């Protein structure tokens, strides 16, 4: 249950900062793209947000590996800890689903 249909970006930061640990993550509805999803991830005591693209033919992170479903995208990044990297090259790790 990393998938939280009910909450906003702000509420996701609050949840991760108070009930999560570094590595905690969840997925939630995107505000800036109605109908789409976003990952909210805690690292070093702060929260980063990562938009998930759904083109209708696959899901991806606006780049990188393509997936048929959102659960398979989440699974792949929980299994491949080095593959999710910033512009400046630091890794964002999806370690612990926040249920």
């Amino acid at each position: 249950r990393w998938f939280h249909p009910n909450i906003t970006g702000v509420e996701a930061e609050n949840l991760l900062l108070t009930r999560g640990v570094d590595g905690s993550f969840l997925a939630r509805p995107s505000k800036s793209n109605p109908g789409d999803f976003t990952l909210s991830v805690r690292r070093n005591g702060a929260v980063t947000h990562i938009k998930i693209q759904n083109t209708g033919d696959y899901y991806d992170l606006y780049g990188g590996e393509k997936f048929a479903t959102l659960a398979e995208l989440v699974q792949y990044y929980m299994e491949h800890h080095g593959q999710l990297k910033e512009k400046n090259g630091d890794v964002i790790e999806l370690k612990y689903p926040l249920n």
Binding site: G9, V10, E13, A46, V47, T48, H49, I50, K51, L61, Y62, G63, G64, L84, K85, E86, K87, I92
Partner: peptide
């Protein structure tokens, strides 16, 4: 909210 820029 801080949105990461990837790659």
């Amino acid at each position: 909210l801080n949105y990461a820029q990837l790659w």
